[PDB]
Amino acid sequence: ALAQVERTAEGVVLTLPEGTVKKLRLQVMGERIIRVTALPGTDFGIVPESIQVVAKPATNVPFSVDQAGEKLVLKTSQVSAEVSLLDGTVSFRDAKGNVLLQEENRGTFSPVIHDPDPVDADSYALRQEFNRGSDEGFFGLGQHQNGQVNYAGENVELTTYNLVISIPFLVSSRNYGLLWDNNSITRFGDPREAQPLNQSLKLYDAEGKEGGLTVRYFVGDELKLTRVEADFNHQFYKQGNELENPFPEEVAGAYKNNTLRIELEGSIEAQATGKHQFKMYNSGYAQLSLDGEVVLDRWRMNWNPWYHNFYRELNAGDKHKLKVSWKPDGGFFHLRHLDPLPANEQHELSLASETGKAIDYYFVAGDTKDDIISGYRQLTGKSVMLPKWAYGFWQSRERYKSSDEIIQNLKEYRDRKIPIDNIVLDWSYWPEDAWGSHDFDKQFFPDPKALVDKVHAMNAQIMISVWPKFYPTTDNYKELNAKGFMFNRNLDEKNLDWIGKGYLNAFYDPFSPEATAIFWKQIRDKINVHGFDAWWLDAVEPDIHSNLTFEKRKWLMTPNARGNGAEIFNAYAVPHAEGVYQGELATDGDKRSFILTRSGFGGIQRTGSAIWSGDIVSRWSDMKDQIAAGIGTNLAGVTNWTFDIGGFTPEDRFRHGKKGFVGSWTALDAEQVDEWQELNTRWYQFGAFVPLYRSHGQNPYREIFNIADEGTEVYNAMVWYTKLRYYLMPYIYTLGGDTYHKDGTIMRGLVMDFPNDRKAWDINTQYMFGPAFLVNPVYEYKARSRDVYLPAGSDWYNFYTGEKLAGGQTITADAPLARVPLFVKAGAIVPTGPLIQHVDEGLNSPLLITVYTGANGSFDIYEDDGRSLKYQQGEWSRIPLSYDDVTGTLIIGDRVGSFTGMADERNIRVRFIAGPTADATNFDKAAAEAVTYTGKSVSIKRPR
């Protein structure tokens, strides 16, 4: 009873005679890429046009189809897929006959359970399982906030949130990755949503007596009520600002005035054995203790809570002591958990989605992780070049309040000769009762074009905040609405925002290009006309009303152009940013646009956008977590990424003192100054080594000169790392060029460059910044050193001192306040330029080429005009650098390419580092051999 085979031009289509899956289509997408579509029906046409994939089946890719017995082989020069004619399961082999990925079953289709709205009869909950009992690593998946780099054996929920951005591209430690092309909420590992604490556990209160947990309510230190609760849950608002479950009547007042405190106490007993996951979702100060030990200490701003996870081994029957402390300060809280899966699934690959019409994924083969990302780029679109100024320093604030305030702070950087390219105008520049009109309050921003012109005249660019949000009072709302493009259920719910008495508001519907075209014409007419340089597309999750349930959030986007809110929950930002990008293209066909946006999904990089992690807090745990967040995003195939240096929201201890509202650090209560300055110093260090370097957030003010005084150690350290960023621009912008021309990745998990080192795989507090720099952020208050693992098979130089160390060891790296531990890989060729104040100053600049000896090297410096689209017609250049360590020779090869404004002649000096040197970072004054390069190859011998 074998399956029937139909040879298509793109591959094959099996018609299985058994089971739920009726048809199984394979499509050759490229030399290294095969699409798999498992359909519970006969009409593939029911499958929605991809939002991620812009790639269509290849036409010029040789492939062969051989059939024998009960196995079908379809292969290219690089990938081999063996399908069973019995059950329809696919097995992927490399070009040398090794099992990369094997499907377990044909996939589990279930009824949709998480769509609050009416469900298409041909929609299902999807699940697919692969590689049971593997030992492989798993990476990518997007920007997540639980410290995971190697996801293997654990859970990730690919939902969309302020702080979370799912990109369903999974990369293995083996030579493949895959794109799971589903727009709805998706889960890695455990299929189930994390449940209430009492759904897979037995609960005992303080009295030891079975039941629920002991829930004490405190006002101040005064106990005001004790009682036992099953599922303690104040996770969401139902409407407006009203909790879903209100607080006991007798402390309800304390909640609203921040005097409320709470404790939970009891014992948990799992009925099953194995690894359990736990999630403490919260705002305010929360602290969880288990077995007498603290497991979680977290604070998050009240309006932006999130989950804090940890796994732990449990034996059934075993009771364990649980203690929790929650000072809500008006925030939220729930406690969730999941018991272990069936043991045979304990170590498998599992992806599930909430709604879809078919299991649809793309197998991507690649000999290196860069090769694998490259497949992702080809499916979902090339990461289009950002303007060169985007890799310079960005200064933002929530918020500047006038044209004057912006020009003043920019001028202050220039006066202090501290480099900066970009300043940002955040929300609330419009008349307060016209959010969405895109007008400029005449009191504070009387002449926008003059303000942009003053920024430009100071050789900076300016970016501006634009939401998908409209008040129904405004004409722009009315215009979108008459075409049916407004999501109106938030108006019905009467959900007012947080501005003034509070306004009625709705978000538009970007899932139709007729809609995004209007959105774009609106901002074109109102904002673009004054010459702003970039768009800060905030709130694109969307976050229509903060803190409603995710079902409400789903419900609110129904109906959109693509069905329900649930069917497209992760995808909002792509079409939204696409419209802005496409309009800009239509407007100026020779200027690079830039978008910064707070959400994404597969393909976002095709809109010339960078993403950031949104509203993180000014905590150390958060800074640390940002490392895994950026890693996971780059390894998901989206490299242009950043965060708010210093965190979006500090605690109250920082925002407000005895001297009132804290702007400058001078207004801080004395006892806080130290941590505010150290947290910012450490974060600026980290910031200069992520793809985009950007300071932003709520008060205190975040300019370097508002964090500390001139001359102080911390001021000088922050200025030093900013300068270093610009010294490094020839290196950095090369990475920038590479994102497009070489499908490159800037912020690299260690698996990309040391894939054969299992111990590197798991590391979540270090990463490669480009090919040369091993970056190791200090993430602990008052730490003056940190463990650093030096990966095996390479030697390493201390960037600051020149000391050479061997890899394959962990060291205790010196980390004084002023320096983040930084190491260069033996063989790096690092180009630097002169000190500059903004990127254009350094065009055609003199170069210092620094060769870190001990291994061969290779680095081709990428240059172009930095602003135009001419690079797409070939207007760019590469200056090839090649180092041979045996002969000790650096070859500066023949220049490749050319572009308008490129200097034919370049002054280049070359130096070699081989050990300790006082000039390790003294770029201007270092001894080095000088060369007048004219595009012709020239060799420089290392000194004897």
Rg (CA), the chain: 28
Contact between 427 and ligand FFX per CB under 6 A: yes
Task: List binders of ligand FFX among 871-910 (CB under 6 A).
Answer: none
One of 837, 850, 853, 877 touching Cl ion (CB under 5 A): 837
Is 615 tagged catalytic?
yes
Q: Write down the least CB distance from residue 811 to Cl ion, Å.
A: 39
Task: List binders of Cl ion among 447-476 (CB under 5 A).
Answer: 459
Is the distance from CB of 451 to CB of 412 less than 8 angstroms? Answer: no
Contact between 303 and ligand FFX per CB under 6 A: no
Amino acid making up residue 218: F
| Total of residues contacting Ni ion (CB under 5 A) | 2
| Total of residues contacting Cl ion (CB under 5 A) | 3
For residue 939, what are the β-bridge partners?
Answer: 891
With contacts defined by CB under 5 A, name the span among 202-210, 342-350, 629-637, 832-840 that binds Cl ion.
832-840
One of 103, 339, 354, 426 touching ligand FFX (CB under 6 A): 426
Token output for 447: 């002449």
- Of 289, 323, 322, 326, residue with least CA distance to 305: 326
- Active-site pick, 94, 348, 538, 644: 538
Q: Where in 582-718 does DSSP place strands (E)?
A: 595-597, 609-612, 641-642, 656-657, 660-661, 693-695
Rank residues 335 and 420 by Cβ distance to Ni ion and give the closer one: 420
One of 241, 258, 289, 459 touching Ni ion (CB under 5 A): 459
Q: Write down the least CB distance from residue 458 to Cl ion, Å.
A: 7
Q: Write down the least CB distance from residue 367 to Cl ion, Å.
A: 44
Rank residues 419 and 436 by Cβ distance to Cl ion and give the closer one: 419
Q: Write down the least CB distance from residue 331 to ligand FFX, Å.
A: 17
Rank residues 84 and 837 by Cβ distance to Cl ion and give the closer one: 837
Q: Choose the contact partner of 785 out of Cl ion, ligand FFX, Ni ion, none; CB within 5 to 8 A by kind.
A: none
Q: What is the spatial order of strands in the sheet that 422-425 belongs to? A: 641-642, 609-612, 595-597, 534-537, 461-466, 422-425, 393-395, 693-695
Distances (CA, A) of 50 to 44, 160, 638: 13, 18, 18
Task: List binders of ligand FFX among 108-137 (CB under 6 A).
Answer: none
Is the distance from CB of 259 to CB of 219 less than 8 angstroms? Answer: yes
Q: Write down the least CB distance from residue 462 to Ni ion, Å.
A: 16
With contacts defined by CB under 5 A, name the span among 1-9, 243-251, 615-623, 834-842 that binds Cl ion.
834-842
Angle between the N-to-C axes of helices 620-634 and 670-687, in degrees from 0 to 180, rounded to the nearest 10: 10
DSSP secondary structure letter of residue 680: H
Token output for 926: 């270092």
- Active-site pick, 339, 615, 625, 738: 615
CA atoms within 13 A of residue 495's CA, in its CB half-sphere: 26
Q: Choose the contact partner of 648 out of Cl ion, Ni ion, ligand FFX, none; CB within 5 to 8 A by kind.
A: ligand FFX
Token output for 655: 């925002």
Rank residues 445 and 733 by Cβ distance to Ni ion and give the closer one: 733
DSSP secondary structure letter of residue 330: T
Rank residues 100 and 410 by Cβ distance to Cl ion and give the closer one: 410
CA atoms within 13 A of residue 214's CA, in its CB half-sphere: 20
Q: Write down the least CB distance from residue 581 to Cl ion, Å.
A: 29
Let me know how many helices (H) and strands (E) the chain has, helices first: 17, 62
Strands 422-425 and 393-395, bridge-based pairing: parallel
Is the distance from CB of 222 to CB of 214 less than 8 angstroms? Answer: no
Rank residues 229 and 841 by Cβ distance to Cl ion and give the closer one: 841
With contacts defined by CB under 5 A, name the span among 356-364, 435-443, 630-638, 838-846 that binds Ni ion.
838-846
> Which 3 state secondary structure label does DSSP give 368?
coil
Contact between 598 and ligand FFX per CB under 6 A: yes
Q: Write down the least CB distance from residue 109 to ligand FFX, Å.
A: 38
Is 31 tagged catalytic?
no
> Which 3 state secondary structure label does DSSP give 745?
coil
Contact between 487 and ligand FFX per CB under 6 A: no
For residue 818, what are the β-bridge partners?
Answer: none
Strands 186-188 and 349-356, bridge-based pairing: antiparallel
Residues 562, 542: Cα–Cα separation, whole Å: 16
One of 539, 752, 763, 774 touching ligand FFX (CB under 6 A): 539
Residues 282, 301: Cα–Cα separation, whole Å: 9
- Active-site pick, 541, 578, 625, 864: 541
One of 176, 511, 643, 648 touching ligand FFX (CB under 6 A): 648
Rank residues 539 and 717 by Cβ distance to ligand FFX and give the closer one: 539
Q: Choose the contact partner of 614 out of Cl ion, Ni ion, ligand FFX, none; CB within 5 to 8 A by kind.
A: ligand FFX
First-to-last C-alpha distance (Å) of the chain:
76
One of 40, 603, 608, 614 touching ligand FFX (CB under 6 A): 614
With contacts defined by CB under 5 A, name the span among 81-89, 453-461, 567-575, 910-918 that binds Ni ion.
453-461
Strands 804-806 and 773-775, bridge-based pairing: unpaired
Task: List binders of Cl ion among 840-879 (CB under 5 A).
Answer: 841
Q: Which helix (H) or strand (E) holds 374?
A: helix 369-380
Token output for 901: 């404004």
Q: Write down the least CB distance from residue 323 to ligand FFX, Å.
A: 33
Q: Write down the least CB distance from residue 908 to Cl ion, Å.
A: 21
In angstroms, how far is CA 609 from the centroid of its own chain?
Answer: 12
Asked, as a colleague might, if the bond just before 592 is cis with ω within 30 of 0, I would say no
Burial (Cβ within 10 Å: 0-12, 13-18, ≥19) of residue 891: middle
Q: Choose the contact partner of 567 out of ligand FFX, Ni ion, Cl ion, none; CB within 5 to 8 A by kind.
A: none
Task: List binders of ligand FFX among 453-482 (CB under 6 A).
Answer: 465
Contact between 414 and Ni ion per CB under 5 A: no
Contact between 289 and Cl ion per CB under 5 A: no
Rank residues 34 and 596 by Cβ distance to ligand FFX and give the closer one: 596
Is 541 tagged catalytic?
yes
Contact between 622 and ligand FFX per CB under 6 A: no
Rank residues 593 and 837 by Cβ distance to Cl ion and give the closer one: 837
Q: Write down the least CB distance from residue 841 to Ni ion, Å.
A: 5
One of 538, 578, 738, 865 touching ligand FFX (CB under 6 A): 538
Which value, to the nearest 10 degrees, does the dihedral of the CA atoms of residues 478, 481, 487, 489 take? 70
Distances (CA, A) of 177 to 28, 78, 100: 16, 14, 10
Length of the chain: 944
Residues 137, 684: Cα–Cα separation, whole Å: 31
DSSP secondary structure letter of residue 825: E
Token output for 548: 């409603």
Residues with active-site annotation: 538, 541, 615
- The site for Ni ion (CB under 5 A) is made up of 459, 841
Query: Where do contacts with Cl ion occur on this chain (CB under 5 A)?
Result: 459, 837, 841
Catalog residues that contact ligand FFX under the rule CB under 6 A: 398, 426-427, 465, 538-539, 598, 614-615, 648
